[PDB]
Write an enzyme that holds these catalytic residues in place. Sequence first.
Site, PDB file in Angstrom:
ATOM      1  N   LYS A   1       0.746  -1.092  -0.020  1.00  0.00           N
ATOM      2  CA  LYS A   1      -0.104   0.134  -0.193  1.00  0.00           C
ATOM      3  C   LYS A   1       0.952   1.245  -0.160  1.00  0.00           C
ATOM      4  O   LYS A   1       1.569   1.639   0.905  1.00  0.00           O
ATOM      5  CB  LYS A   1      -0.942  -0.051   1.175  1.00  0.00           C
ATOM      6  CG  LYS A   1      -1.561   1.219   1.723  1.00  0.00           C
ATOM      7  CD  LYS A   1      -3.163   1.013   1.911  1.00  0.00           C
ATOM      8  CE  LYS A   1      -3.949   2.534   2.180  1.00  0.00           C
ATOM      9  NZ  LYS A   1      -4.866   2.155   3.315  1.00  0.00           N
TER      10      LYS A   1
ATOM     11  N   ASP B   1     -11.827   4.862  10.742  1.00  0.00           N
ATOM     12  CA  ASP B   1     -12.574   4.982   9.320  1.00  0.00           C
ATOM     13  C   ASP B   1     -12.975   3.576   8.976  1.00  0.00           C
ATOM     14  O   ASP B   1     -12.544   2.784   8.158  1.00  0.00           O
ATOM     15  CB  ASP B   1     -11.367   5.241   8.147  1.00  0.00           C
ATOM     16  CG  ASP B   1     -12.185   5.749   6.779  1.00  0.00           C
ATOM     17  OD1 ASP B   1     -13.580   5.903   6.668  1.00  0.00           O
ATOM     18  OD2 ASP B   1     -11.390   5.938   5.813  1.00  0.00           O
TER      19      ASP B   1
ATOM     20  N   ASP C   1      -2.695  12.485  11.777  1.00  0.00           N
ATOM     21  CA  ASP C   1      -2.381  14.028  11.602  1.00  0.00           C
ATOM     22  C   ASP C   1      -2.163  14.380  10.078  1.00  0.00           C
ATOM     23  O   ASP C   1      -2.708  15.248   9.616  1.00  0.00           O
ATOM     24  CB  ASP C   1      -1.455  14.674  12.524  1.00  0.00           C
ATOM     25  CG  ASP C   1      -2.152  15.156  13.739  1.00  0.00           C
ATOM     26  OD1 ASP C   1      -3.044  15.085  14.094  1.00  0.00           O
ATOM     27  OD2 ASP C   1      -1.252  15.282  14.709  1.00  0.00           O
TER      28      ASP C   1
HETATM   29  N1  LIG Z   1      -4.220  -6.352   2.327  1.00  0.00           N
HETATM   30  C1  LIG Z   1      -5.181  -6.278   1.217  1.00  0.00           C
HETATM   31  N2  LIG Z   1      -5.372  -7.398   0.476  1.00  0.00           N
HETATM   32  C2  LIG Z   1      -6.049  -7.498  -0.704  1.00  0.00           C
HETATM   33  N3  LIG Z   1      -6.685  -6.355  -0.945  1.00  0.00           N
HETATM   34  C3  LIG Z   1      -6.535  -5.049  -0.397  1.00  0.00           C
HETATM   35  C4  LIG Z   1      -5.763  -4.791   0.792  1.00  0.00           C
HETATM   36  N4  LIG Z   1      -5.603  -3.660   1.111  1.00  0.00           N
HETATM   37  C5  LIG Z   1      -6.431  -3.027   0.157  1.00  0.00           C
HETATM   38  N5  LIG Z   1      -6.923  -3.736  -0.780  1.00  0.00           N
HETATM   39  C6  LIG Z   1      -7.456  -3.586  -2.089  1.00  0.00           C
HETATM   40  O1  LIG Z   1      -7.377  -2.271  -2.762  1.00  0.00           O
HETATM   41  C7  LIG Z   1      -8.558  -1.281  -2.313  1.00  0.00           C
HETATM   42  C8  LIG Z   1      -7.949  -0.113  -2.148  1.00  0.00           C
HETATM   43  O2  LIG Z   1      -7.766   0.184  -0.905  1.00  0.00           O
HETATM   44  P1  LIG Z   1      -7.460   1.731  -0.387  1.00  0.00           P
HETATM   45  O3  LIG Z   1      -7.639   1.621   1.122  1.00  0.00           O
HETATM   46  O4  LIG Z   1      -6.372   1.901  -1.109  1.00  0.00           O
HETATM   47  O5  LIG Z   1      -8.742   2.371  -0.871  1.00  0.00           O
HETATM   48  P2  LIG Z   1     -10.299   2.020  -0.335  1.00  0.00           P
HETATM   49  O6  LIG Z   1     -10.960   1.052  -1.062  1.00  0.00           O
HETATM   50  O7  LIG Z   1     -10.096   2.035   1.344  1.00  0.00           O
HETATM   51  C9  LIG Z   1     -11.121   3.464  -0.320  1.00  0.00           C
HETATM   52  P3  LIG Z   1     -10.700   5.159  -0.007  1.00  0.00           P
HETATM   53  O8  LIG Z   1      -9.449   5.414  -0.946  1.00  0.00           O
HETATM   54  O9  LIG Z   1     -11.834   6.160  -0.193  1.00  0.00           O
HETATM   55  O10 LIG Z   1     -10.388   5.173   1.734  1.00  0.00           O
HETATM   56  C10 LIG Z   1      -9.344  -2.058  -1.343  1.00  0.00           C
HETATM   57  O11 LIG Z   1     -10.675  -1.832  -1.403  1.00  0.00           O
HETATM   58  C11 LIG Z   1      -9.055  -3.500  -1.390  1.00  0.00           C
HETATM   59  O12 LIG Z   1      -9.942  -3.894  -2.532  1.00  0.00           O
HETATM   60  O1  LIG Z   2      -4.116   3.576   5.337  1.00  0.00           O
HETATM   61  C1  LIG Z   2      -4.676   4.359   6.099  1.00  0.00           C
HETATM   62  C2  LIG Z   2      -4.357   4.439   7.439  1.00  0.00           C
HETATM   63  C3  LIG Z   2      -4.449   5.558   8.338  1.00  0.00           C
HETATM   64  C4  LIG Z   2      -3.712   5.743   9.358  1.00  0.00           C
HETATM   65  C5  LIG Z   2      -3.003   4.805   9.991  1.00  0.00           C
HETATM   66  F1  LIG Z   2      -2.267   4.869  11.010  1.00  0.00           F
HETATM   67  C6  LIG Z   2      -2.607   3.395   9.085  1.00  0.00           C
HETATM   68  F2  LIG Z   2      -1.769   2.470   9.242  1.00  0.00           F
HETATM   69  C7  LIG Z   2      -3.347   3.429   7.861  1.00  0.00           C
HETATM   70  N1  LIG Z   2      -3.069   2.031   7.349  1.00  0.00           N
HETATM   71  C8  LIG Z   2      -2.881   0.835   7.421  1.00  0.00           C
HETATM   72  C9  LIG Z   2      -3.406   0.520   9.047  1.00  0.00           C
HETATM   73  C10 LIG Z   2      -3.455  -0.555   9.253  1.00  0.00           C
HETATM   74  C11 LIG Z   2      -2.876  -1.854   8.456  1.00  0.00           C
HETATM   75  I1  LIG Z   2      -2.992  -4.100   8.908  1.00  0.00           I
HETATM   76  C12 LIG Z   2      -2.760  -1.344   7.184  1.00  0.00           C
HETATM   77  C13 LIG Z   2      -2.667  -0.063   6.671  1.00  0.00           C
HETATM   78  F3  LIG Z   2      -2.355   0.033   5.375  1.00  0.00           F
HETATM   79  N2  LIG Z   2      -6.047   4.877   6.049  1.00  0.00           N
HETATM   80  C14 LIG Z   2      -6.937   5.680   6.789  1.00  0.00           C
HETATM   81  C15 LIG Z   2      -8.023   5.837   5.662  1.00  0.00           C
HETATM   82  O2  LIG Z   2      -9.143   4.889   5.930  1.00  0.00           O
HETATM   83  C16 LIG Z   2      -6.930   4.867   4.621  1.00  0.00           C
HETATM   84 MG   LIG Z   3      -8.745   1.883   2.861  1.00  0.00          MG
END
Ligand SMILES: Nc1ncnc2c1ncn2[C@@H]1O[C@H](COP(=O)(O)OP(=O)(O)CP(=O)(O)O)[C@@H](O)[C@H]1O
Ligand SMILES: O=C(c1ccc(F)c(F)c1Nc1ccc(I)cc1F)N1CC(O)C1
Ligand SMILES: [Mg+2]
Length: 281
Positions: free
Chosen positions: A40, A133, A160
């Site tokens: 990610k 969220d 933040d």
């Molecule tokens: N650990 C994981 N394993 C498999 N797919 C994942 C994943 N984390 C995220 N994804 C996929 O990629 C998509 C993108 O997730 P991301 O957090 O980037 O955007 P989102 O779908 O949460 C909506 P927003 O961008 O509005 O918060 C997710 O819906 C999921 O389908």
């Molecule tokens: O990616 C984040 C995010 C925000 C704060 C934080 F501290 C995190 F670690 C985040 N990412 C995040 C947290 C736990 C796992 I297991 C995997 C992850 F990628 N988002 C907040 C929105 O909802 C999207």
């Molecule tokens: Mg997300």
Amino acid sequence: MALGELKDDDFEKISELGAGNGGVVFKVSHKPSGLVMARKLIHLEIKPAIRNQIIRELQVLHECNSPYIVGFYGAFYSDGEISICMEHMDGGSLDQVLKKAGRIPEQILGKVSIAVIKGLTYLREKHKIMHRDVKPSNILVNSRGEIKLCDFGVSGQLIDEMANEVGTRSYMSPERLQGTHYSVQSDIWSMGLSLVEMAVGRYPRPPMAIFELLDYIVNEPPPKLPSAVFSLEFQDFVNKCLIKNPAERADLKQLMVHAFIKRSDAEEVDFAGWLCSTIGL
Ligand SMILES: Nc1ncnc2c1ncn2[C@@H]1O[C@H](COP(=O)(O)OP(=O)(O)CP(=O)(O)O)[C@@H](O)[C@H]1O
Ligand SMILES: O=C(c1ccc(F)c(F)c1Nc1ccc(I)cc1F)N1CC(O)C1
Ligand SMILES: [Mg+2]
């Protein structure tokens, strides 16, 4: 360490898993260890001081161990974009699942309920993390019928540094909308809201301009389920999650033992299979 130090030469993109407002997610191979992970990449321009403070605040994720929280592997910063390497859920998130399904039936949602109550409970009690969220795209599922949470707010600074680049303003509770400091009672709200959504198969509020919505949520009463076609228990659950005044909202203890939870525990739901059926796994 378990993984040592991660540098993105070792990763080899496999496919794209999805993307959204704040970046993109790839299925990737960690060549030197064999591990398949989901990667990610969050682009953030920030003063190094403050990016290392983030890449380290995240190490707390390593002590998150629950069958209901996606599993962590590490985080490294590379050329602009903080990377969070996490467990790969071969079934995307319930948002993708909803797209394919149309609706998610009540019985499958009581299992998700369990997974969320419990996964929020782990974080609350073992780590004092509020999710921050909870929405369908932040709840993931794998062909083994597992249902884990992710994208919770571990890192104070990441939180933040993110409050400037706007959220699911739409999933925020009325209090949080009127300015209140996030409390757990907000996570609950957003859970309920999510269940209603996935039950009805669309954002459960009458379509308006974004700004109207925000006041709409503050001013008008909460969503409710269509009442002909969902158990009176489900309707209560959701309802209890959705009381506007955060002091009267049901909490995680009170929810953990609701009619609809207990009924759902007892029930035998081959979610694993339902899933592969629904999205072709
Ligand atoms: N650990 C994981 N394993 C498999 N797919 C994942 C994943 N984390 C995220 N994804 C996929 O990629 C998509 C993108 O997730 P991301 O957090 O980037 O955007 P989102 O779908 O949460 C909506 P927003 O961008 O509005 O918060 C997710 O819906 C999921 O389908
Ligand atoms: O990616 C984040 C995010 C925000 C704060 C934080 F501290 C995190 F670690 C985040 N990412 C995040 C947290 C736990 C796992 I297991 C995997 C992850 F990628 N988002 C907040 C929105 O909802 C999207
Ligand atoms: Mg997300």
